[PDB]
Task: inverse folding
């Protein structure tokens, strides 16, 4: 099979060295050519550059001076460095396997031909935000189910992550046990500058219990892993 | 009094600079005031016959193994020549009549190296030359009535004018020719080949007209050889295109080839060479 | 830019500047909230996993634009579409082609699910109040939410996310309201009034 897993700070202050890594699997770093693509929020993806062992590596002209690439063969990882980050650099940084190709419009004799690229398999990405605001850890207050003698049949339970910075925050229920009916909502940014997302599961009427319902919230930028138990 | 700001494209050979940031001028403006060919006439070499007046005769030597000079054994008489078309080119005689039996060479003095060695063929080696760029002819009026036919933008990819000759056929014909050199230079000798020494475009390249444009094709590719004898493939050729020509010692004129609109492809026979030799 | 196509018809999508040479254009289908999935390369050569529905313009034409032909549009094809242009005449583009949102029409209608949540008890002892209205599975995302203090509208503290589609015709919107501890007990019962497309649905809650 094939799998990609980006990783990194998820936030860096202005004028610093953003360092991101791409965990590789399913193959070796020596074999395939790689490429990175950042995507600003709501805008069109700006392609970063392509890297391969044996030094076949080129960068974007719009950011040529600031970027750096590498591959760790022993660690089997796709590295990435970028210096002097600014507000224009905050985006979702994907990691993509890339394949070369030859388009020939001529006799080939010349050099009349051109290498076009296409990234067939992607990664999930990592949300790299940029702000001089210090991290805050998430607070977790467990939202009790509908009133302590909830309405007849088909009850609902929820959690709440309030006042965390920055996005994102990952949520899963009993180490991802139920994974059914979960409707983890988008975050809302507040006036203070902190996000807050809810997560809720729908449970049938046979929920008097006591079944063990403990939602799991992870915010890596503050290393905060809070697992909370909800009770009516 | 009023003037314009028209734009046109020119080939590299036509222009030359003088040093604003950069500039250029036509290479003919320092030699001779030129005239454009009317884009109404054609340059096609049609078979022309040369007939004699009354009380005159023209003698046709019907001898296969004729080296051009001396007593031709069987002679016929004719009023007009066979259709001879004005195919004008350098280093390569095109579309003419092949020799009948063996590739026979013709030279004034085979010993005096300064005399060109005209070579006639026995098989017409096939040559296909094109210019792939689909082009624009924008009629820029420089009045009154006078209408310059400029080139406009380019439609499609960019790739020069080239020529194709089957490698195998030429690798065989060259052997057929060297076979007839050895009857001049000893039963067992070695005949190498090289490209032109040096000079103008008209001399060191394959100056010819096809469809309205004047190709100057490098001849270094074909002349790659060295002769030691006692599937599908072609030998591609790379040509530059010119429009402002100065053909002839200096007596053709300078003439602006009106740009051709479209893709120009021509197929031709090669029937001879104009060789030279440098103990 | 948005393309609205009747169901089961054929959609078309336009990408990039006009052609200058023979090209090789890539086509990408980024679904909302996910990563771009590679759809077509070589201007008409689709890889494994892509049906022969999707088409394109062969990169042999000059002067015309890059076209994406979706035959027999289905609901899943609702997405953003990008394209990477490789002209033999223009330098290598590192800014992907600008987007084009496909919108299949007449899903047609989804009634929202409004889930009002009081503040949590641990939050109550922590001296902060927060109301969590949660609106799911609605179409389209044109919801506007008001809040009521037993009979009266509430002006400040109102927080509301945006209608967000999620790998489904279903949308999503939250609604938070910050309240002081003294007033969740002071008033009778609080109301979340979610308005969608012309239907207002309201859920209220009362303290113990
Ligand atoms: C002087 O001499 C020199 C030689 O020294 C000579 O040079 C030659 O010039 C010609 C033109 O002047 C030039 O032809 C070009 O060739 C391009 C590439 O073709 C080559 O590769 C392919 C495939 O190889 C790749 O993929 C393989 C796996 O499939 C892989 O293994 C390879 O490693 C490689 O990566 C191959 O098909 C070609 O072989 C073709 O020709 C052979 C004979 O030469 C023949 O045996 C082959 O079959 C094939 O010909 C046809 O064969 C199949 C059936 O077997 C048919 O289905 C097809 O019809 C084939 O044509 C070569 O190996 C070629 O792409 C160029 O054509 C594209 O570009 C032009 C210009 O832009 C367009 O007008 C064309 O329409 C075409 O664009 C189509 O394809 C491209 C890419 O595939 C797409 O981007 C376009 O979308 C479009 O294709 C799609 O849409 C069209 C639109 O309707 C649709 O029809 C298709 O279905 C598709 O959906 C162009 O033909 C030649 O390459 C060059 N040199 C050599 C060495 O050949 C000079 O020209 C001579 N000068 C003279 C005489 O004046
Ligand atoms: C060595 O010998 C070979 C072969 O002998 C020779 O190749 C020949 O090249 C020339 C041009 O390079 C070819 O001539 C062209 O022929 C076609 C059309 O001809 C046929 O068309 C009708 C269609 O029904 C036939 O019925 C008819 O019998 C003809 O055979 C065209 O591609 C060309 O036409 C244009 O060019 C000519 C003027 O340059 C005119 O003939 C004609 O009026 C066209 O001109 C028009 O072009 C403008 C473009 O916009 C247009 O706007 C104007 O109105 C203008 O009038 C051309 O006739 C010839 O066919 C080739 N040989 C063969 C066997 O076909 C090599 O060139 C030669 N070697 C050298 C060095 O010359
Ligand atoms: C538009 O113009 C730009 C330049 O302004 C041009 O970028 C060039 O692309 C070519 C390839 O398309 C690059 O050539 C490579 O250079 C590296 C340098 O080390 C070599 O290692 C490469 O060799 C490998 O790759 C070849 C192509 O795949 C293989 O055929 C070969 O066998 C080797 O495996 C290769 O030579 C060139 O470096 C860049 N130049 C710059 C300045 O970036 C771009 O391709 C043009 N685009 C179009 C559509 O014409
Ligand atoms: C007309 O212009 C051409 C082009 O500049 C001149 O040709 C040059 O002649 C000199 C002779 O010393 C050569 O060194 C250059 O290489 C030639 N240039 C080119 C582009 O061929 C020509 O001499 C000029 N005629 C004059 C001044 O009478
Ligand atoms: C190019 O050469 C071929 C010979 O291979 C010529 O074709 C011959 O033309 C003559 C008349 O000129 C005919 O009598 C022959 O029968 C033709 N041969 C074949 C095999 O068909 C062709 O005409 C030449 N083209 C030119 C001179 O433009
Ligand atoms: C070169 O480009 C011209 C465009 O200027 C092409 O002319 C077009 O030809 C098609 C069909 O051949 C017609 O439908 C268009 O109306 C023509 N356009 C104009 C402006 O006249 C011409 O075909 C091209 N040549 C080649 C060989 O592709
Ligand atoms: C020159 O052009 C002619 C015609 O375009 C080529 O002859 C063709 O050869 C193919 C085989 O490869 C045949 O299927 C065609 O029928 C031929 N066409 C004609 C009109 O006879 C020839 O191969 C070209 N020669 C070179 C050296 O490029
Ligand atoms: C003939 O071919 C030779 C190559 O065998 C050419 O010599 C080259 O000339 C260029 C100048 O443009 C030099 O940069 C190269 O170093 C030369 N190569 C060698 C091996 O010496 C020569 O220019 C060609 N001449 C003509 C008139 O075609
Ligand atoms: C004709 O062809 C020859 C060889 O195909 C060309 O010679 C090349 O010249 C460049 C410099 O201009 C050198 O870098 C190459 O190494 C040369 N090639 C070889 C094989 O030696 C020549 O430039 C072409 N044009 C002319 C006018 O001679
Ligand atoms: C004549 O042909 C030979 C080969 O056909 C060419 O020789 C090349 O020489 C260089 C180094 O001198 C090698 O790297 C190449 O591999 C040789 N070519 C081949 C095909 O092996 C030579 O350049 C040709 N001369 C001209 C003027 O074109
Ligand atoms: C993945 O990343 C971790 C930490 O960056 C590293 O220890 C590991 O070697 C990487 N590769 C794999 C295959 O896990
Ligand atoms: C041919 O050239 C030689 C020397 O180059 C000369 O002696 C002779 O007179 C010339 N003419 C002939 C042999 O007819
Ligand atoms: C074909 O060409 C090669 C070199 O290009 C030459 O060695 C060989 O003798 C040629 N074949 C014939 C039959 O002359
Ligand atoms: C020597 O050349 C003659 C013609 O010049 C030829 O007839 C003869 O066969 C050659 N001698 C050989 C090939 O041994």
Result:
């Amino acid at each position: 099979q094939v799998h990609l897993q980006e990783s990194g700070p998820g936030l860096v202050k202005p004028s610093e060295t953003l360092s991101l890594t791409c965990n590789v699997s399913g193959t070796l770093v020596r074999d395939n050519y790689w490429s990175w693509i950042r995507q600003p929020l709501g805008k069109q993806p700006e392609w970063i550059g392509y890297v391969h062992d044996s030094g076949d590596t080129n960068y974007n002209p719009s950011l040529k001076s600031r970027v750096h690439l590498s591959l760790d063969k022993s660690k089997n990882l796709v590295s990435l460095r970028l210096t002097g980050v600014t507000a224009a650099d905050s985006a979702i940084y994907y990691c993509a396997t890339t394949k070369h190709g030859r388009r020939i419009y001529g006799v080939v004799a010349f050099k009349e031909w051109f290498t076009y690229f296409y990234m067939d398999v992607w990664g999930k990405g990592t949300s790299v935000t940029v702000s001089s605001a210090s991290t805050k850890g998430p607070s977790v207050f467990p939202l009790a189910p509908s009133s302590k003698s909830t309405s007849g049949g088909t009850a609902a339970l929820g959690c709440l992550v309030k006042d965390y910075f920055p996005e994102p925050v990952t949520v899963s229920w009993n180490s991802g046990a139920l994974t059914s009916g979960v409707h983890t909502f988008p975050a809302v940014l507040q006036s203070s500058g902190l996000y807050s997302l809810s997560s809720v599961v729908t449970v049938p009427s046979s929920s008097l219990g006591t079944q063990t319902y403990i939602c799991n919230v992870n915010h890596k930028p503050s290393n905060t892993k809070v697992d909370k138990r909800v009770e009516p | 009094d009023k003037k314009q700001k028209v734009y046109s494209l020119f080939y590299r050979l036509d222009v030359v600079q003088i040093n604003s940031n950069k500039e250029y001028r036509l290479i003919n403006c320092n030699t001779s005031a030129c005239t454009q060919a009317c884009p109404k006439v054609s340059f096609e070499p049609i078979p022309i016959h040369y007939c004699a007046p009354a009380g005159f005769a023209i003698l046709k030597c019907k001898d296969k193994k004729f080296n051009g000079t001396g007593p031709c054994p069987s002679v016929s008489t004719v009023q007009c020549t066979h259709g001879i078309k004005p195919v004008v080119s350098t280093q390569l005689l095109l579309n003419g009549s092949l020799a009948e039996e063996e590739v026979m060479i013709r030279s004034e003095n085979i010993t005096n190296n300064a005399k060109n060695i005209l070579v006639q063929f026995n098989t017409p080696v096939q040559i296909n030359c094109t210019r792939p760029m689909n082009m624009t002819r924008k009629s820029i009026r420089i009045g009154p009535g006078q209408a310059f036919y400029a080139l406009g933008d380019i439609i499609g990819d960019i790739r020069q004018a080239h020529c194709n000759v089957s490698k195998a056929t030429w690798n065989e014909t060259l052997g057929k020719v060297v076979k007839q050199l050895r009857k001049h230079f000893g039963n067992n000798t070695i005949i190498r080949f090289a490209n032109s020494s040096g000079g103008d475009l008209e001399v060191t390249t394959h100056s010819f007209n096809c469809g309205g444009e004047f190709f100057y094709c490098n001849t270094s590719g074909l002349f790659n050889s060295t002769w030691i004898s006692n599937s599908n493939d072609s030998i591609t050729l790379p040509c530059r295109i010119k429009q402002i020509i100065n053909m002839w010692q200096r007596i053709g004129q300078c003439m602006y080839a009106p740009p051709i609109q479209g893709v120009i492809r021509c197929v031709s026979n090669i029937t001879g060479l104009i060789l030279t030799r440098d103990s | 830019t948005f393309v609205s196509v009747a169901p089961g018809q054929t959609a078309r999508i336009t990408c990039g500047e006009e052609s200058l040479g023979s090209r090789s254009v890539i086509w990408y289908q980024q679904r909302p909230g996910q990563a771009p999935s590679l759809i077509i390369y070589n201007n008409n050569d689709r890889p494994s996993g892509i049906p022969d529905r999707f088409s394109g313009s062969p990169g042999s034409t000059f002067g015309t634009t890059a076209t994406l032909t979706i035959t027999s549009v289905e609901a899943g094809d609702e997405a953003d579409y990008y394209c990477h242009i490789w002209d033999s005449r223009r330098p290598t583009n590192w800014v992907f082609g600008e987007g084009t949102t496909l919108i299949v029409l007449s899903q047609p209608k989804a009634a929202p699910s409004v889930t009002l949540f009081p503040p949590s008890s641990e939050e109550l002892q922590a001296n902060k109040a927060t109301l969590v209205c949660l609106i799911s599975d609605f179409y389209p995302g044109a919801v506007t939410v008001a809040w009521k203090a037993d009979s009266s509208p509430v002006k400040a503290g109102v927080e509301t996310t945006t209608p967000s589609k999620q790998s489904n015709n279903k949308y999503a919107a939250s609604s938070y309201l910050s309240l002081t501890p003294e007033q969740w007990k002071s008033h009778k019962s609080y109301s979340c009034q979610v308005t969608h497309e012309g239907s207002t649905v309201e859920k209220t809650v009362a303290p113990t």
Remarks:
- Residues B 195-196, 204, 220 surround ligand 8 (CB under 6 Å).
- Chain A is about 0% helix and 40% strand.
- The first strand of chain A starts at residue 4 and ends at 7.
- Chain A touches chain C through 44 residues (CB under 8 Å).
